[PDB]
């Protein structure tokens, strides 16, 4: 109902139709799967050290080249 914070640890690359989406690796900070590292797609400027609020932590983005 409030989501789970995750911390960005690595930048992979740009993607999307018009280069608007970035793929990152994040580490869960709270919840059932705290400590796991998964990759995600993010819209907007982002840098290492930012914190995202995920609404669910079971979907993983498909790897890009």
């Amino acid at each position: 109902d409030e989501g789970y914070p995750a911390e960005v640890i690595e930048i992979i690359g740009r993607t999307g139709t018009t280069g608007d989406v970035t793929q990152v690796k994040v580490r869960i900070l709270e919840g059932r799967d705290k400590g796991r590292v998964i990759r995600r797609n993010v819209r907007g400027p982002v840098r290492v050290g930012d914190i995202l609020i995920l609404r669910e932590t079971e979907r993983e983005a498909r790897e890009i080249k």
């Binding site: 999307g16 797609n41 993010v42 819209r43 907007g44 400027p45 914190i51 995202l52 609020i53």
Partner: protein
Amino acid sequence: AKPLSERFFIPHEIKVMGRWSTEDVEVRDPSLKPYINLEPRLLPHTHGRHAKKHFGKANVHIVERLINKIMRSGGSHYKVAGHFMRREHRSLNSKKVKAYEVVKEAFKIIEKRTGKNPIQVLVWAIENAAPREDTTSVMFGGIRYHVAVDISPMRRLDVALRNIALGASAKCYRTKMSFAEALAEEIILAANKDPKSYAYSKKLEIERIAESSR
């Protein structure tokens, strides 16, 4: 009308507009914590020296961000509440004095109506109006589809501020309400998660659409 003590006001401490302190304001959201600048500062006017550098807007006081956000016309090339709002010559663009006065009066109204520190109410409003999930578009067979993605904190802050400004602009358009009153009303409504707030309803709709397309 306005008393002489207010027309010629002399400050003596470094605090926002010489009237309010941000010592006890706290940001609950961990993600927006490093992007809401609350350092002590008297005059919120940095003369646009931050836009040059990447991530430069991070270290700009939040009140000046609001002032810049409302310094606009409002409805140029898309409709807000079903209307174009093209102010043109009568628009507030490039008049930072009038926007400063509007924000000051709105803060006075907010403090009078609730009895709390206005900066705290503003922080609560932007916290409640910032979405957490968005979508991006793909094209297949001549049809447009949505795919759910996540939002970075800085974009969340930008969207929250823009939606608050747009709601305030829409409330005072061709009605008897004034701009300052509309801004105060919008902030108060957004702080209480009231659906009558434009920003809160917009956030709810965005998150619903994002959820229905995972």
